[PDB]
Point group: D2
Chain length 117, copies 4
């Protein structure tokens, strides 16, 4: 269905962070990152449809959020090159992962919400 979704918020303007590039990678057996999925956040700051239950197998995944380009479009010079979230997906009942990021120019936070539908 939709086992992985990303949401990005802008703490300076109190708004969804729209049109932010997100790249997802999976760790391959040789220890390198393979492209897995990508997209841009919508009007609501969300990115859906990255993958499906069948393809999203147990493994280590990296979600990269292009925060620098977002701030530069606003005319604000930011600190980070990008924000990176690295985690292991574990089967253990049916799981859905929501990765949220809250952005400021010199600070971000990220939270995972993991639920069973």
């Amino acid at each position: 269905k939709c086992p992985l979704m990303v949401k990005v918020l802008d703490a300076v303007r109190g708004s969804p962070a729209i049109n932010v590039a997100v790249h997802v990678f999976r760790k391959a057996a040789d220890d390198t990152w393979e492209p897995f999925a990508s997209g841009k956040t919508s009007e609501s700051g969300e990115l859906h449809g990255l993958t499906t239950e069948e393809e999203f197998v147990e493994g280590i995944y990296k979600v990269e959020i292009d925060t620098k380009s977002y701030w530069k479009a606003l005319g604000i010079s930011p600190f980070h090159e990008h924000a990176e979230v690295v985690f292991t997906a574990n089967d253990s009942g049916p799981r859905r992962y929501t990765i949220a990021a809250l952005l400021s120019p010199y600070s971000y936070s990220t939270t995972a919400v993991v639920t069973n539908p």
Copy 2:
């Protein structure tokens, strides 16, 4: 419609914070807080239906989240008595307010997302 909604997340368990009491107050002319609306967060950690466009007039509002009771039910002793969010509602186009809080035992964060539907 639904111009004010509250969402609460648990950073320790990576889950919605369920069954958390929330009280909303409005500042009255004599500078005291009058009860305005209340409820408990749902399974998804959200609280909807607090008020309507007609009643939600410009003013200063306080949202109180009973965080202490939440942690005590989990067996964790927390720092704060509650979390409080105080803000002015301003008419300026149609506005919807989402107040989010992310809870840990010794730390919380709160963010406002303000959008036009």
Copy 3:
């Protein structure tokens, strides 16, 4: 120092300077009584609010005037202030650091609690 406040600015990547802070203690009649006040320094810190002798058991409120801070920078922020409410010293004297990280539409606050 039994009670110290530290405030950072997440937009500029700097300490938040000249931020007004007011501290209250809940009195017997359930009212907030003024306890101490001050402004953050160039390092974003506020020291010297109280002493160990005066800082007795109780419920305290630390109010940080975030709105005035952002307005002076030309930004119209969401919150009127940030308030932190906590019980202090109920298992004996501790040292409290209250940190706040500020953005115009969001803030976080953390307590670090040490046993002398």
Copy 4:
């Protein structure tokens, strides 16, 4: 100190002690080269990673081993580590404080950047 790391624990309200930190610098061939490493002290801080002379312009990565920290406390956390990637010293020498606030399913990181 040109580069300092500070790590706090939001579950316990304390500094995060004995946290491994590794720093890398992007080399000419676009690989991450090891630059410095260490562990946080009893105050949650890591000092002495580098010097002004060695800390030249570049893209740096600070990796904080959050997973090992939580596991030693009996908690199975979400993230493998926290990584902070930034360009340093491109308008001249600055001093950098990288702070991280940790919870098992969430973290925040802030930079405070000062001009000597």
